[model samples]
Target chain A: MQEEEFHKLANFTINHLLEKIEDYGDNVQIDGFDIDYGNEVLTLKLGSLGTYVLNKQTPNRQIWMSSPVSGPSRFDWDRDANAWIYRRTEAKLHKLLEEELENLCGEPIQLS
Target chain B: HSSGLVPRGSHMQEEEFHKLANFTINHLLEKIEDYGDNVQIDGFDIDYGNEVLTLKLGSLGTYVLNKQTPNRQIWMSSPVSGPSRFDWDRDANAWIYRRTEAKLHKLLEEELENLCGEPIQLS
Candidate 1:
């Protein structure tokens, strides 16, 4: 994909995610985990489970996430599906993050 | 109440995950090979070894895909785009990145088209 396309997709997706998480954090009080978004990176810190990092890799043209439940996953924009996909195992990004967030907080939150 | 050091099924889950990953990639490789005619897809060349699969295109550079056994993820470095890591999703019945439910085969179909300068289906 072209650099232009990459930026467009990455920016939109990450911003969307950050907005959702930030709003969710404000709306609900989840005992321990704290959400922080800065420097084009979004992070979650749990009192017990270390930290989960989600950042944009411009050169790589991918969205990357670090999970305590699993590990690092890199996502590439799939033009066919119009979604950022982790081409390795092909898992959806929001669903996995939602699952992890649910596990950490003991509450279900859907991340579209 | 077990110590967090071992975490009981920790390594076992990691091991099983890797086995499934290895199986998935190998299975996909077999499907590609079965497309037969060795000379089938033009310009793009494929090679397999252990858990690694490499794709070489005459002028388009190369791509490397391998299993990350420790993380229980699949890693792909693409010449056309860049790098991506995938995780297995049992409910999705495929290796899917956690954030986007995009399937592996679908991603390849798109990338391979750009690399090979021709349409191709990985499934």
Candidate 2:
């Protein structure tokens, strides 16, 4: 994707995901679940479940994530699918977030 | 202040980053404890909480260092140098602030020497 397009979509995607995770934390009963977003990076600390870090890599035109569930994965925009996808596994970013978060929080999560 | 030792866009595994950062902080923790009475005489204080390490040097100032996990950087607030972000340079094998090209340990060594009127080894 072009740099300009990547910025627009990546920023929107990150902000949207942040809000969804924040809302999940607010409603969940899990202890020590926290969210912090800064400098184009967002982090979620899920107590004993562990931490997740997501950030935009403008130089690579990618969004990278470090997750307790799956370690690290780099996501690139799949314009055809209209989703950020991990090329290695062909996994959608939001889907991964929803799966891992729901498993930890013991409830459904919507990230798309 | 560019020492030409920057990583040159090299990226490290998240696990490696965590290992290096944790090692650095733990090392500092041990060193401060080793200083013992000397540090206390200067009214220095050190604490670790919420993944943040704080070192207080009485009348001088407080130093706050925390892990910036996503960026693979350690963000530091120095009484002398104000603020800096240090990236792990594998080749240099040091946490260095790219802007000033100053190694975190060396910077602390210099500033601590000035503050304590004695050489302090951090590396």
Candidate 3:
């Protein structure tokens, strides 16, 4: 994909992620977590497990997110799958976040 | 200062990236601990858990180093250097900062030497 296309797709994916989290509407209740979106960055506070930072890296044409469970992962847009995927590990962004978030919050959240 | 740097690195393969990153960082962690008195005199603590390395240095504050498997970059959070993303430069055989062209090993080398008069190498 071209650089412009990559940026567009990445932005869309992250916003969609925030929207899905919004869809949750405080459903995760176990002393819960806070989702903060500001300055085009998303921060998820997972209680004692350190905060996750999902930062948008436009120059690299990628989405970089740091996780406590698995460390940091930088994802590239996959044209065929229409998903942001970590090419090396084949870990899908939304799916991994969903699984980890459920474990942190103790609630099953459909994050895609 | 980090503005003009472009993220440059060829992933080559997933396995190589993770293995090399883990090996390099893990070696550095062990070396720091083995250095002994330098860290203890400065009240530095090292912790490696869940594939992330955390260093609690006395006056320098806490720093973190993590293997970014997907990007093939090692992300570092240092009180000295702030946050920098480094990519594996195959030709150089070292992790180089995207913007500054600085190598990860060299950076840590200088930092450690300055911190405790111990100059070490990681290969």
Candidate 4:
């Protein structure tokens, strides 16, 4: 798929997640995850605390959860670099927060 | 605030005031063009009683009065782009307001004093 196609898909998924989380309220905890369909990327940010990542696709067609504190982590499609090209600082914090959120939420949420 | 502490109004005469007002308006318009958002000014008011001047400004859009300080200082608040409120501070002659959020109210009062150098007379 082209990058634009992926971006559209990612946006759709992210928007869906935002709506769901908003309904759940502040106490709802959700995990952060991403899916890379070659040109497209889908990310999910969920947890009960403050601002959780719903989803984000960078202009370069990179798909990941945008964490408020840390950088992006755990890319499904890793290039030869063995790392995601975007800024990593926010992703690290996001990973930690996502882990904590998963523990609090007590279940994995899947959005296909 | 004591009336004696007010600073003289904009040193520019009425024509100058008009020019300054226009300059300020144009500057603000440029910002809106670049940011694609409306600018919001808070705390500054013109014509406090009859509210005529205040109304005139409101018609233009969201804008706050320019506050003055006793030491002839003027500061304007900017929208907080991130964790801090972007402000123009004239103290160090720098365009930045480096103070924290808690100090904003005090800063506004000081700016007001600077803008109104002479006290408004009570009839």
- Give the number of the best model, judged by TM-score: 2
Top candidate on DockQ is 3
**Tens-digit lDDT track of model 2 for B63-106:** 65667654577866555665577888768988888878999999
Classified by CAPRI criteria, candidate 2 counts as: incorrect
The global Cα lDDT (0 to 1) of model 1 is 0.64
Q: Kindly report, for each predicted structure in the order presented, the TM-score of its chain A compared with the true chain A.
A: 0.85, 0.95, 0.87, 0.41
Question: What is each predicted model's overall lDDT from 0 to 1?
Answer: 0.64, 0.73, 0.68, 0.33
Residues A1-112 of candidate 1: C-alpha lDDT, one tens digit per residue: 7878776777788788877887777766666646765545565655445455565565566777655567667788777777778887888888778887777667778678
- State which candidate has the highest lDDT: 2
Cα error, residue A6 of model 3, in Å, equals 40
Q: Arrange candidates, best lDDT first.
A: 2, 3, 1, 4
Per-residue lDDT over A6-78 for candidate 3, one digit per residue giving the tens place of the 0 to 100 score: 7577678878888887666466554535675654556565554555667555445667776656665768877
Question: Sorted by DockQ, highest first, which candidate order results?
Answer: 3, 2, 1, 4
DockQ of each: 0.02, 0.03, 0.04, 0.01
Worst 10 residues of 3 chain B by lDDT: B1-10
- TM-score result, candidate 2: 0.53
Point out the worst 10-residue segment of candidate 4 chain A by lDDT: A34-43
Error of 4 at A45 (Å): 10
Q: TM-score (0 to 1) of chain B, per candidate? A: 0.72, 0.85, 0.80, 0.28
Looking at every candidate separately, what fraction of the true A–B Cα contacts under 8 Å does it contain?
0.00, 0.00, 0.00, 0.00
lDDT of 4 at A29: 34
TM-score of predicted chain B, candidate 2: 0.85
lDDT tens digits by residue: candidate 2, A3-108:
7888799899999998888888888898878787754556677775556666665556778675656655768888689998888889999998899788778999
